[PDB]
Ligand binder design. Structure first.
Ligand SMILES: Cc1cc2nc3c(=O)[nH]c(=O)nc-3n(C[C@H](O)[C@H](O)[C@H](O)COP(=O)(O)OP(=O)(O)OC[C@H]3O[C@@H](n4cnc5c(N)ncnc54)[C@H](O)[C@@H]3O)c2cc1C
Ligand SMILES: NC(=O)c1ccc[n+]([C@@H]2O[C@H](COP(=O)([O-])OP(=O)(O)OC[C@H]3O[C@@H](n4cnc5c(N)ncnc54)[C@H](O)[C@@H]3O)[C@@H](O)[C@H]2O)c1
Ligand SMILES: Nc1nc2c(c(=O)[nH]1)N[C@H]1C(S)=C(S)[C@@H](COP(=O)(O)O)O[C@H]1N2
Ligand SMILES: O=C(O)c1ccccc1O
Ligand code: MOS
Ligand code: MOS
Ligand code: FES
Ligand code: FES
Ligand SMILES: [Ca+2]
Lengths: 1286, 99, 50, 50
């Protein structure tokens, strides 16, 4: 094998034994020790592994820079390529690069796991365009996801490249002259002609072909050899499809495959050309050539706008997309509709054929012979009387898989409206790209008119049929899109042929970005406050710089011990069944295999879980797909994975209960009914002028913390001691669960948590599933062992937010006043109790939201099902109950024919009112947030503007909604409301603070340091928090319920007071002395400089039996007004503007709090409008990656995003008058959901019916499918019993 | 610990003070983030001074558990500890001694 | 002294804020900590000696 | 201490000590040391950041 030679951050790398299967990500992290680049999904959708690649382009004669996903980039494609990682542009140990400094100072980094990738996407942009435009900046992140920030700060901080939370004037200017030079050695190697290379791996042989002749000879000799260019398809097939291609040939270097030729019929691109190159070339062509000649080019460009992100488009080849022949290719329908010419060759043969329906004979196949390869593609210039359109509709605009995608072309007779040629090609409507030939053939010679539109729609409805069991589901939606897309094409062509109805015009407009506008309002600190007192100041997250530099260490970034092994969980593929046998014979054959672990290997107890109703390893039966049966331990993660995959489990299915409906029907519940009842329902309903009953459903949610679950377990070999590094919000439970499984005293187990790359409740308990398994592995092998879940494992196994089904009945007066409400809640709990009970309790605690309901009855049942156990997720049941509340409230308004804001206001609680659980509302600030939000959002003025827009638009509608929220603060389990801290002051005066809380990106440690600094009256520079550990602060409650700042703040405060009391005598004897002087004096006088701090939230203790006692310490409030614009023909929508007024008392840190508000809001936005998990009827999760599970993207946030923290509202109930902010803002994301609902009502009023009081059901999430299907029109209708009683 | 059996003696002391078997007590290591500004282990006074510090820490624990012991005198050490935890009473404390 | 185990130290650089964790065969974790911090020029609270 | 497993990337240090009771250090040549396989670096007074 030939040596693989490339550079990483200017340093030459010579890999003498390159394995074709090794990805750049794995190489960087495991071989080069550069852990800044992260693994977030391994499928190209999160961008956490983003790096920059630089190479000398022979055909262009210059150095080019582009981004790429390290997780999909085979190192074997990088010969003579220069890689730049986050570590290559700057660091806190040297100097931060402007990109790093700005994302950090702008508060664009919270947990920090996505920061390196975003830093690299931005860095790459700047290396290409030193002065990018705002649009270029946003486009740089089409392939980067952030779960914490809400994106606003990242974009606003980077916008600088084109009181206040940050000051741009302090930013170091970008100076391109100081950027690392392209490796001189590489520039020399450009003068030596390419030579074919051969790489030999454990299972694969890689041939880097240097010439077309070599490629063809190789294909003739090895027809089966798999070509690989960008590896964005093959990489997926290898990693997720269990595919193994023994021989790969990379033809990327071949000149012919990279040639760009401008011919008389069109522009030819070599098949190896990256989509980004095609895009650049076509953009140039569209700018220089007449509009009439670039119809097809613009269609291609429109698809490319929404084709993955920059990372994928920079490596993905044109040939790769065409030959992969995916049913949902966004380009093949366009190439097919335009008859794009394909030049195909093999040794001794060459042919050129226009792509047509026959090119794709069957699933994933094309008309190429085994020895043939696609050489080039010629995208045709459009002719006179020829028009083209390309459309794509997915679940999310950016980086998503098409539900339906198309290419449509029409050629008319010269200067006429008479059809000569018509091609409507679709993706996502069959197991291959297809053309509606039957339908289009019938229109040849017909004229472009209403009858043709009707005929084509009827034809499409019949020809593009979908069986009820069609893969991908969403049958009605997809069929509707096929017709809707044609309608848009039809209208667009009419426009191009020209007199179109003004109200119809917007239907032909392609998506257009509107300039962003962000404003944050918060309170300045008192004029006389010391500069050293940072409480109330917008201090950036203490680890932001290190997160931007990739220096921040997350669990897997911790170096592995030389003898450290890897664990891979072996999980159930059945929802419910008996385990008849387990065969490891094949696994044992995998190289590096160490052992298979199962229930019988457990030395202590196999009973685990918050309520001891779970197994560590399945015994006799599996109760959900993903149920952990055992685990394979191997010398490498790849070997562990391969071995685990071949472990054969034999099952005998048992009746399974999957859905809430299934559970109810089978009386499958956990515990008895939960209930809160106040007043007289019977009497309430009698008094009501109106009564509305209904059912509502809210889908679950995957936490999607950028860093998945991870645990490293280090067995000491002494007295059962074990030290674990875990990504968990609950070190205490991790510690006791590990101890329980091992059968050793808790004092033998040490759990350390540096930080989590996100938690959101998902790491409150379910992190033990991995921790205990890894602990067992360490115990059994005596070796350190680790396991970081791949995204698909994580989403399948660890649980998510509880889906909720609600049956409600609300009684109200014509005025909109509520007089009675009954709501029965049902949550899908999964295969264990976990936190399901408390979650339902919190749900019941918030079924009122901010409205006083004299007569109310709320019940809840936990459905026991054969699905992974659901758990805590930011909101903890509150969002579901609040959603249900706002749903009937929205219906009350419609029914009464009164303005929604009016109905909400008159039903709103007032200062001093008691909730349905009888707790007094003291300092109820909703009214202020409400009036201030109405004013700053200009709600009323915009309300009329919205109505105007709707009268002027037939196929697009806008919606506006302002909703309030209150969130009870405190664990609803009394004993969890306790917090400890441990503080040491060393003899140099430096302070080390330790508390029971963990950092997951919310800036808890930052706040604690701010608190300690104020309490001790010393600069924050002298205080430090390293980690959270069970041997510093024991019996800690999980970092949850948004009360960490409150409780650990008090514990830290108390510890500081003790320190001050001890130093007091020395301060008195030396008043003019320094902190250092007093500390040394205390030490010299033998006064202990170490102490604990403890806090117990007072007056808590609610009882559901008596409906009495304080459930919460106080409530956090807020109001959000959101406006949206929906595309009634596709289901897509724009979040135009959102205005938030949040009451966080006297913020300890307005930067972090506004960050929490935006982050929570966006996560809520995701819950209610984009995020959806799909399961087969048998209970198997389909959605296991960012490719199918769409969380909010950079482009998903409100274009105009305004956040204001309520002024002058100190909260005497918490540390320094602050208020918990973690979870409270999430529900405000529902403001978007109801704005969408409002928009849909307008659409239905337009094309559905005239009943202005109709109450159509809209479950959450309000995805494009639900939105489109709700916009009933002549199209949805197109997509007969013998008798009917009269 | 350098072989002189200091931890052994501290466990013996803690056990006597708390009136619980030594089997329920453990000393894993010495670390600057648990006990700061420590004098070097020397002058043969380690047993003397750390014994007092451990003793004092134990006294604080006993005082915090006292209410629960009185509340349930026939209970076990485990019962009192869990009761204390459930009642949100800190089960962590420092101990200090100055000759 | 001829302690059967000679002097020994393992130093683990964390890569963050000058943090370093050391496993040391010493009777004086305090001085080890302060001396290491002094040599590195970082606050004592950044050094952990076990 | 030394029984603690080494990290995969853990390096080893060997002290370079004076062979003279009292003298001025005129120069230090590590050209031969640099040839030893596995050599990473030679550390001296000037390498101390603090
Ligand atoms: C996060 C993510 C988002 C994506 N988004 C989209 C999207 O929006 N729309 C869409 O359509 N696709 C999308 N893709 C799919 C993928 O990126 C495309 O199919 C890509 O263009 C394939 O190019 P490649 O060079 O990476 O292919 P590879 O993976 O290198 O090769 C793909 C297949 O093409 C064959 N092949 C390659 N070149 C040739 C040739 N010259 N002659 C004959 N056979 C050849 C290979 O043997 C292999 O079977 C996405 C992928 C990821 C990972
Ligand atoms: O992953 P993939 O390669 O199968 O692509 C998937 C999508 O293609 C479509 N598809 C594949 N086979 C189909 C069939 N027989 N009927 C309808 N759509 C089909 C579905 O929309 C599915 O979501
Ligand atoms: N960046 C980031 N922010 C976050 C989270 C997170 O995992 N990452 N967790 C949320 C959740 S579910 C909770 S309960 C609180 C927990 O931290 P706190 O109590 O200090 O507010 O932070 C919220 N904000
Ligand atoms: O939010 C709560 O009320 C709660 C209660 C018990 C455990 C975890 C929690 O988040
Ligand atoms: O209370 Mo958060 O960890 S759901
Ligand atoms: O006092 Mo002993 O360490 S000589
Ligand atoms: S890990 Fe590479 S794109 Fe997510
Ligand atoms: S800061 Fe982006 S995912 Fe956490
Ligand atoms: Ca559960």
């Amino acid at each position: 094998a030939d040596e693989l030679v490339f550079f990483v951050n200017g340093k030459k790398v010579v890999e003498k034994n390159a394995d074709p299967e090794t990805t750049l990500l794995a190489y960087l992290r495991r071989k080069l020790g550069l852990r800044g680049t992260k693994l977030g999904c391994g499928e190209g959708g999160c961008g956490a592994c983003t790096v920059m690649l630089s190479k000398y382009d022979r055909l262009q004669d210059k150095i080019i820079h582009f981004s790429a996903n390290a997780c999909l980039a085979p190192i074997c494609t990088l010969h003579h390529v220069a890689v730049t990682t986050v570590e290559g542009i700057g660091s806190t140990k040297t100097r931060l690069h402007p990109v790093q400094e700005r994302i950090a100072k702008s508060h664009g980094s919270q947990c920090g796991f996505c920061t390196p990738g975003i830093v690299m996407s931005m860095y790459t942009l700047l290396r290409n365009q030193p002065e990018p435009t705002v649009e270029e900046i946003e486009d740089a992140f089409q392939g980067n996801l952030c779960r914490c920030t809400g994106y606003r700060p990242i974009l606003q901080g980077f916008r600088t490249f084109a009181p206040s939370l940050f000051n741009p004037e302090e930013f170091m200017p970008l100076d391109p002259t100081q950027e690392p030079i392209f490796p001189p050695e590489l520039l020399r190697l450009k003068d030596v002609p390419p030579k074919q290379l051969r790489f030999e791996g454990e299972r694969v042989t890689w041939i880097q072909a240097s010439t077309l002749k070599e490629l063809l000879d190789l294909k003739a000799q090895h027809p089966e050899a798999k070509l690989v260019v960008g590896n964005t398809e093959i990489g997926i097939e290898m990693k997720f499809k269990n595919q193994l291609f023994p021989m790969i040939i990379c033809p990327a270097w071949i000149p012919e495959l990279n040639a760009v030729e401008h011919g008389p019929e069109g522009i030819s691109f070599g098949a190896a050309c990256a989509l980004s190159s095609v895009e650049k070339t076509l953009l140039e062509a569209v700018a220089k050539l007449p509009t009439q000649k670039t119809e097809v080019f613009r269609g291609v460009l429109e698809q490319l706008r929404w084709f993955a992100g920059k990372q994928v488009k920079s490596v993905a080849s044109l040939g790769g997309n065409i030959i992969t022949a995916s049913p949902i290719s966004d380009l093949n329908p366009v190439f097919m509709a335009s008859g794009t010419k394909l030049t195909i060759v093999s040794r001794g043969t060459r042919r050129t054929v226009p792509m047509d329906h026959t090119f794709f004979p069957s699933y994933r196949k094309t008309l190429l012979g085994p020895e043939e390869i696609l050489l080039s593609i010629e995208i045709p210039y459009s002719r006179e009387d020829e028009f083209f359109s390309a459309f794509k509709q997915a679940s999310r605009r950016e980086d998503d898989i098409a539900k339906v995608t198309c290419g449509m072309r029409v050629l008319f007779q010269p200067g006429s409206m008479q059809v000569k040629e018509l091609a409507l090609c679709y993706g996502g409507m069959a197991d291959r790209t297809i053309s509606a030939l039957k339908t289009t053939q019938k229109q040849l010679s017909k004229f472009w008119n209403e009858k043709l539109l009707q005929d084509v729609c009827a034809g499409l409805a019949e020809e593009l049929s979908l069986s009820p069991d069609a893969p991908g589901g969403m049958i009605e939606f997809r069929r509707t899109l096929t017709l809707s897309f044609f309608f848009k094409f039809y209208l667009t062509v009419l426009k191009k042929l020209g007199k179109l109805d003004p109200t119809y015009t917007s239907a032909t407009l392609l998506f257009q970005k509107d300039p962003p506008a962000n404003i944050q309002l918060f309170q300045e600190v008192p004029n006389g406050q010391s500069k050293e007192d940072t409480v109330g100041r917008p201090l950036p997250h203490l680890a932001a710089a290190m997160q931007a530099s990739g220096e921040a260490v997350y669990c897997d970034d911790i170096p592995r011990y030389e003898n450290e092994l890897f664990l891979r969980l072996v999980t159930s593929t059945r929802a419910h069944a008996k385990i008849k046998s387990i065969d490891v014979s094949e696994a044992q054959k995998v190289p590096g295999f160490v052992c298979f672990l199962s229930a019988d290997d457990i030395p202590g107890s196999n009973e685990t879980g918050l309520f001891n109703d779970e197994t560590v390893f399945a015994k006799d039966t599996v109760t959900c797909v993903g149920h952990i049966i055992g685990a394979v331990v191997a010398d490498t993660p790849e070997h562990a994975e391969r071995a685990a995959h071949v472990v054969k489990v034999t099952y005998e299915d048992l009746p399974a209960i999957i859905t809430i409906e299934d559970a109810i029907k089978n009386n499958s519940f956990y515990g008895s009914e939960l209930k809160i009842e106040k007043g007289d329902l019977k009497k309430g309903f009698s008094e009501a002028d109106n009564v509305v009953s209904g059912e509502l459903y809210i889908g679950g949610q995957d936490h999607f913390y950028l860093e998945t679950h991870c645990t490293i377990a280090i067995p000491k070999g002494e007295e059962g001691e074990m030290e674990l590094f875990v990504s968990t919000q609950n070190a205490m439970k991790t510690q006791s669960f590990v101890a329980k499984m091992l059968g050793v005293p808790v004092n033998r187990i040490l759990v350390r948590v540096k930080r989590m790359g996100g938690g959101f409740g998902g790491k409150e308990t379910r992190s033990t599933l991995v921790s205990v398994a890894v602990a067992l592995a360490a115990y059994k092998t005596g070796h350190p062992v680790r396991c970081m879940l791949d995204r698909n494992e994580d989403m399948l196994i660890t649980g998510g937010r509880h889906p909720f089904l609600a049956r409600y009945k609300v009684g109200f007066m014509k005025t909109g006043t509520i007089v009675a409400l009954e709501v029965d809640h049902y949550s899908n709990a999964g295969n264990s109790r976990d936190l399901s009970h408390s979650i339902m309790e919190r749900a019941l605690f918030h079924m009122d939201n901010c409205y006083k309901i004299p007569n109310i009855r709320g019940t809840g049942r936990l459905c026991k099902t054969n699905l992974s156990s659901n758990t805590a997720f930011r909101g903890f049941g509150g969002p579901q109950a609040l959603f249900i509340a706002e749903n009937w409230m929205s219906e009350v308004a419609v029914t009464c024919g009164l303005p929604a804001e009016e109905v909400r206001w008159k039903n709103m609680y007032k200062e001093g009112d008691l909730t349905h659980f009888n707790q007094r509302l003291e300092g109820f600030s909703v009214p202020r947030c409400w009036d201030e939000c109405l004013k700053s959002s200009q709600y009323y003025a915009r309300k009329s503007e919205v109505d105007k827009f709707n009268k002027e638009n037939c196929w697009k509608k806008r919606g506006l909604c302002i909703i309030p929220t209150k969130f009870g603060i405190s664990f609803t389990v009394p004993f969890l409301n306790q917090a400890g801290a441990l503080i040491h002051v060393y003899t140099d005066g430096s302070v080390l603070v330790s508390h029971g809380g963990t950092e997951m990106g919310q800036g808890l440690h930052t706040k604690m340091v701010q608190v300690a600094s104020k309490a001790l009256k010393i600069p924050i520079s002298k205080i430090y928090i390293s980690e959270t550990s069970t041997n510093t602060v024991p019996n800690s409650s999980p970092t949850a319920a948004s009360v960490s700042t409150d409780i650990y703040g008090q514990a830290v405060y108390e510890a500081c007071q003790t320190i001050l009391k001890r130093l007091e005598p020395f301060k008195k004897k030396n008043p003019d002395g320094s902190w250092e002087d007093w500390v040394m004096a205390a030490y010299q006088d033998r006064v202990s400089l170490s102490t604990t701090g403890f806090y117990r939230t007072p007056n808590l203790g609610y009882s559901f039996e008596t409906n009495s006692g304080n459930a919460f310490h106080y409530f956090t409030y807020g109001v959000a007004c959101s406006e949206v614009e929906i595309d009634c023909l596709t289901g897509d929508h724009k979040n135009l503007r959102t205005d938030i007024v949040m009451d966080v008392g006297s913020s300890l840190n307005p930067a972090i709090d506004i960050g929490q508000v935006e982050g929570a809001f966006v996560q809520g936005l995701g819950l209610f409008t984009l995020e959806e998990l799909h399961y087969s009827p048998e209970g198997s999760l389909h959605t296991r990656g960012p490719s199918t599970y769409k969380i909010p993207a950079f482009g998903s946030i409100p274009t105009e995003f305004r956040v204001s923290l309520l002024r002058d509202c100190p909260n005497k109930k918490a540390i320094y008058a602050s208020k918990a902010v973690g979870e409270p803002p999430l529900f405000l994301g529902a403001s978007v959901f109801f704005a969408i609902k409002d928009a849909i009502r307008a659409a239905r009023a337009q094309h559905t019916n005239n009943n202005t009081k109709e109450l159509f059901r809209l479950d959450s999430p309000a995805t494009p499918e639900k939105i489109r299907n709700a916009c009933v029109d002549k199209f949805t209708t197109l997509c007969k019993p013998w008798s009917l009683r009269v």
